[PDB]
Short mmCIF file of C-alpha atoms and ligand atoms in Angstrom, two decimals:
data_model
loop_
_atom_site.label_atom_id
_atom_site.label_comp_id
_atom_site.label_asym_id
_atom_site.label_seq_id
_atom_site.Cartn_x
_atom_site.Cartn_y
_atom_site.Cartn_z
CA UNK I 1 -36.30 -25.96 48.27
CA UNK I 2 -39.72 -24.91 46.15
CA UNK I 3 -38.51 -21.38 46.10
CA UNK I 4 -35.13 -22.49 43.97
CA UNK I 5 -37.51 -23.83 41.16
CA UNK I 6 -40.49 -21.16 41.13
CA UNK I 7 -37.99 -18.71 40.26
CA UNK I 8 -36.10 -20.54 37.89
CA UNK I 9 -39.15 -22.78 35.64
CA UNK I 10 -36.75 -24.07 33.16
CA UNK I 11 -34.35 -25.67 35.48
CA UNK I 12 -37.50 -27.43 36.97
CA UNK I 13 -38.83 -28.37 33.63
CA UNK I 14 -35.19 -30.09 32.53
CA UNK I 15 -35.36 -32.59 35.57
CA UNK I 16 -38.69 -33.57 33.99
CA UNK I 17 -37.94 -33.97 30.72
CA UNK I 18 -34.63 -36.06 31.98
CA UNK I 19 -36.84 -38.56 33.57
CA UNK I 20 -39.19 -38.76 30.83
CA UNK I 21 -36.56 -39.35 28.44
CA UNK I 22 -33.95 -41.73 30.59
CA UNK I 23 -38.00 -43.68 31.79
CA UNK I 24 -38.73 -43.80 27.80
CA UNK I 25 -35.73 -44.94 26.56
CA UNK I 26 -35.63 -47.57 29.70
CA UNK I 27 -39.12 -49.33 28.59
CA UNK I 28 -38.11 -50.90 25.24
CA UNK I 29 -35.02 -52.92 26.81
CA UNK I 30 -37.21 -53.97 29.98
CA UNK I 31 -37.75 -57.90 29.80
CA UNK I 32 -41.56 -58.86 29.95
CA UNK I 33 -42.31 -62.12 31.90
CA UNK I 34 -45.72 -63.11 34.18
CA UNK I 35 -43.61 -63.57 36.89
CA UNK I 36 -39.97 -62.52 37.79
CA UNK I 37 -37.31 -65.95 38.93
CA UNK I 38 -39.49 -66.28 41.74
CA UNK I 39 -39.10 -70.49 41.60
CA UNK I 40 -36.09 -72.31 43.75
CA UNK I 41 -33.78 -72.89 40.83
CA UNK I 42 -32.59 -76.36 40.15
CA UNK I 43 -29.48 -78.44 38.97
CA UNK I 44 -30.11 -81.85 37.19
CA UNK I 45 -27.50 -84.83 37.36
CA UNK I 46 -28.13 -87.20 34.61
CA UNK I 47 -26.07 -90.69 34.83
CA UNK I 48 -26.46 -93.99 32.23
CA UNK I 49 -26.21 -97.45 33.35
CA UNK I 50 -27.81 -99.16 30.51
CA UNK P 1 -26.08 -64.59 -2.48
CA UNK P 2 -29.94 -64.27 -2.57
CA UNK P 3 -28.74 -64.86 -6.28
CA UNK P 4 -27.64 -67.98 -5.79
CA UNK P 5 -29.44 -71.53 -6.33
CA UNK P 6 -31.76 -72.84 -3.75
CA UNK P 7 -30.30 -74.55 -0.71
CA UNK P 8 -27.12 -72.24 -0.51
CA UNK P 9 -27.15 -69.90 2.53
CA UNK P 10 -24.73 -66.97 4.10
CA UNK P 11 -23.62 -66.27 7.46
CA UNK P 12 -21.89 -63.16 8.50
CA UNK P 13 -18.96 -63.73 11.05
CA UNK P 14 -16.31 -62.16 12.99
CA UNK P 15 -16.58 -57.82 13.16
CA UNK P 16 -18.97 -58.31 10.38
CA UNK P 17 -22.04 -60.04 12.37
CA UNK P 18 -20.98 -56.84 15.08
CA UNK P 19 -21.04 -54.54 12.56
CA UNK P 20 -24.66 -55.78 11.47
CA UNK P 21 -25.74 -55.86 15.08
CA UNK P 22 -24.64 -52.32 15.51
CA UNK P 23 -26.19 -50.29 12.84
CA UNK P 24 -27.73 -47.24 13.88
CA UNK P 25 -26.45 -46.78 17.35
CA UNK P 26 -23.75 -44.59 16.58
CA UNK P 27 -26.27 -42.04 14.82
CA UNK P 28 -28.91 -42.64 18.12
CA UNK P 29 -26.18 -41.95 20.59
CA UNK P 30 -25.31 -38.85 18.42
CA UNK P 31 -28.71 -37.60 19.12
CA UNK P 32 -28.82 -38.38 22.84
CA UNK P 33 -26.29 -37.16 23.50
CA UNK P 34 -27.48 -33.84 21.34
CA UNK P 35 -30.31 -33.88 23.72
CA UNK P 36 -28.70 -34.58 26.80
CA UNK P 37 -25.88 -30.94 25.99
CA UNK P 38 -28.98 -29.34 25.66
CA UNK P 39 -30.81 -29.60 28.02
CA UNK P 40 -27.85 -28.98 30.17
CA UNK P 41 -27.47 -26.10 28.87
CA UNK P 42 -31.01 -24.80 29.31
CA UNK P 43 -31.08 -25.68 32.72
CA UNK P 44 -27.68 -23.46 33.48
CA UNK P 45 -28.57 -20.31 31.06
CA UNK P 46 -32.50 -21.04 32.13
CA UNK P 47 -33.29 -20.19 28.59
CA UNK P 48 -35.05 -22.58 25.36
CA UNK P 49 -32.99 -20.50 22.60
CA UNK P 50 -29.58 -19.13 24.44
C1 PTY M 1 -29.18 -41.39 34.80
C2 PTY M 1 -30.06 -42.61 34.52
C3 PTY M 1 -29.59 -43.29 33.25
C4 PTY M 1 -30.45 -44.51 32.99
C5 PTY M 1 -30.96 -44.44 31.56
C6 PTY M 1 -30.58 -45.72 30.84
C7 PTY M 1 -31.67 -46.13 29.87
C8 PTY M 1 -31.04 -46.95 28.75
C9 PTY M 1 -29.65 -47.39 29.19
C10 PTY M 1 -29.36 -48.81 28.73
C11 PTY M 1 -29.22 -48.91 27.21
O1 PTY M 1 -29.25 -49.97 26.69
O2 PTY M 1 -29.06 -47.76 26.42
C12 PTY M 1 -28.06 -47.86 25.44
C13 PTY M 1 -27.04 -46.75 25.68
O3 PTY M 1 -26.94 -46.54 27.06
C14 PTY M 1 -27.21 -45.23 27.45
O4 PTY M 1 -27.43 -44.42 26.63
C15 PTY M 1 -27.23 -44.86 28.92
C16 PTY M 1 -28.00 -43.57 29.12
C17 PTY M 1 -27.26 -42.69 30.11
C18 PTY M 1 -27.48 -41.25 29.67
C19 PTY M 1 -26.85 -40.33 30.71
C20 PTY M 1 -26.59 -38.97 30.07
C21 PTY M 1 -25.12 -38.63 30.19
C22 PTY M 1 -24.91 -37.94 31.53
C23 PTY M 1 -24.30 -36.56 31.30
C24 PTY M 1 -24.87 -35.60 32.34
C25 PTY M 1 -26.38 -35.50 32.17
C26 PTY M 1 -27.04 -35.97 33.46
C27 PTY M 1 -28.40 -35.29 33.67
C28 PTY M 1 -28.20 -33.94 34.34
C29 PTY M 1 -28.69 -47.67 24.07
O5 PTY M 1 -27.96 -48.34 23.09
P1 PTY M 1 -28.57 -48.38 21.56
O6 PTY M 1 -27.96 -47.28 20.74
O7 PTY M 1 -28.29 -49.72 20.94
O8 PTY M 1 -30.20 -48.16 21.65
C30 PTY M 1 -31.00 -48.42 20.54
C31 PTY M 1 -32.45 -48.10 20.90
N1 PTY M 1 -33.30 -48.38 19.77
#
C-alpha cells in the first residue's frame, strides 16, 4: 500500500537503493554474447580407418 | 623470478594460485556487507544518521 511508503520516505528510498546496488553489482559478471545458445547443440564421433 | 635469465618462467599452484585469484574480495565483501547493515538499519529506524 502507497500510504505505508508516503509516510515513511526512507523505507521507500532503501528498496531503491537495494536494487540499484544488487542491478550494479549484477552488470560486471553478466556474459556478453550476440546471441544467447540459441543453436541445436551437437556431439561429434570421430573414428580412423586409415 | 623476473630476476632470472630469459626463458625461465613461474607458475603459482595449489592455495597459492586461489590465494592470487582471491585478492580483494574479502575487503569488497567487508564493504557490502557495511552497506547492506546499513541500509537495514535506515529502513527500520527511518533515519540517515540514527
Ligand atoms: C537479493 C538479490 C541478490 C542478487 C545480487 C547478486 C549480484 C552479484 C552476486 C554474484 C557475485 O558474483 O557476487 C559475489 C558475491 O556474491 C554476493 O555478494 C551476493 C549478493 C547478495 C547480497 C544480499 C545481501 C545480504 C542479505 C541480507 C538481508 C538484506 C536483504 C535486503 C533487505 C562477488 O564476489 P567478489 O568479491 O569476487 O566481487 C568482486 C567484484 N569486483
Amino acid at each position: 500500500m502507497s500510504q505505508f511508503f508516503i509516510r515513511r520516505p526512507v523505507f521507500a528510498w532503501v528498496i531503491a537503493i537495494f536494487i540499484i546496488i544488487f542491478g550494479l553489482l549484477s552488470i560486471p559478471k553478466l556474459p556478453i554474447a550476440r546471441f544467447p545458445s540459441v543453436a541445436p547443440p551437437q556431439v561429434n564421433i570421430s573414428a580412423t580407418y586409415p | 623470478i623476473a630476476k632470472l635469465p630469459k626463458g625461465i618462467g613461474y607458475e603459482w599452484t595449489g592455495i597459492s594460485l586461489q590465494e592470487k585469484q582471491s585478492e580483494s574480495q574479502m575487503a569488497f565483501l567487508l564493504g557490502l556487507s557495511m552497506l547492506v547493515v546499513f541500509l537495514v538499519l535506515a529502513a527500520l529506524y527511518e533515519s540517515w544518521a540514527i
